Amino acid sequence: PAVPVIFGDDLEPAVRERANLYHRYSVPYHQIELALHALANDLLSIQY
């Protein structure tokens, strides 16, 4: 539905991360369980 990683940078459309580069999977895990790993996206952001 939308990009999971939020890079605040201003980029050329050509290289800008977009929705269709990602897919969302529904897995047999409670959100609580996946929670921590979701932070990676936040870390991946301010670092690279």
Partner: protein
Amino acid sequence: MSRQMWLDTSALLEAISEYVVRCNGDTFSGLTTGDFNALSNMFTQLSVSSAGYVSDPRVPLQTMSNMFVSFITSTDRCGYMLRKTWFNSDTKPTVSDDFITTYIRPRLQVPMSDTVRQLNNLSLQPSAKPKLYERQNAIMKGLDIPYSEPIEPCKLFRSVAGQTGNIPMMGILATPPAAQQQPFFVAERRRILFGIRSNAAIPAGAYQFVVPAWASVLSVTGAYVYFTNSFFGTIIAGVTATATAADAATTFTVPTDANNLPVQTDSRLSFSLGGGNINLELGVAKTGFCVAIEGEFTILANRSQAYYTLNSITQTPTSIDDFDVSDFLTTFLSQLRACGQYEIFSDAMDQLTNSLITNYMDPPAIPAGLAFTSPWFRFSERARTILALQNVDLNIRKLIVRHLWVITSLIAVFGRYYRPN
């Protein structure tokens, strides 16, 4: 973000409430009822995720409302959603505020949801008293409302060329007549009223009644049409409720049915005030008469727009209801008073209302003559006043009203759990 995003979330909150009421006193020890499971899962989606386990649902809900009030009260933050474009587009705004990144975001399923919606309008027994959601969709996107959903006609009432009030007409219908007067068309909670009152008699024959703009979208089933002399309990003067066992059958006819509709009969009628004028054939002369249509009133399929788009509005000033927001604010108000903010809030709202009004008229300045005679939570009135501004183009006032409503509704939903202390 998107006006859409706010709705999807509002809907979720309204869903949470629904399932709370569903679970009240149904939370037993040895079982996980489906309703509770759903309630549990909804709580789970409300927070971020990084909000961890939910041990006491009161907290995340409480936290969310608190952040909402400190947001909805600061122009600097919630400004973005006050500009014209927020109401008329699905443009993801470039605004950074951790309230929105946390709570507001697309929640509904597509396209399955939209579809279930459409199917409902064709459903047999819709919710008698619907969620703000539906109203929100109508007032903002101008979507359709269920075909069988009932409504109290008197709300629909708007000012027309002739009579400029539904309630005011009361004090006059109770004053004896000087001579044969003009017809009148009024509405109660559960019935529609029309007729002619005179101090002299009125001959038997055909009389035409021009169904008012606002009422030309009403439909009724299981209705009883009879002659009566009361309007909201107040007695109507200058009319007769008399009849002989063998009087000449009095009937009327609407442009949608080729057969005559009887009056004063134990037969349950079904007809619609759409299409034209009611042609009434009075069987036996009467000294002023009043017909009553009492039954289940619904808005004619696919014409609810007139009401919610605020299109049924012809003249200025005008009478206008609140689409029921008051009925939903109750709780949030109680919560406000209960912690002493009812005042500090009431101030911040005038501020919000004023800034909204502003972004609608070029050039950017509060129009002169604007002075409210009521507080933010008495919408019905404030709407009247917004609509009464001679300065601004009518269609813009209409928008402002609609806009204010959506924001107001949003409050009624999100603030309910406010507790700062």
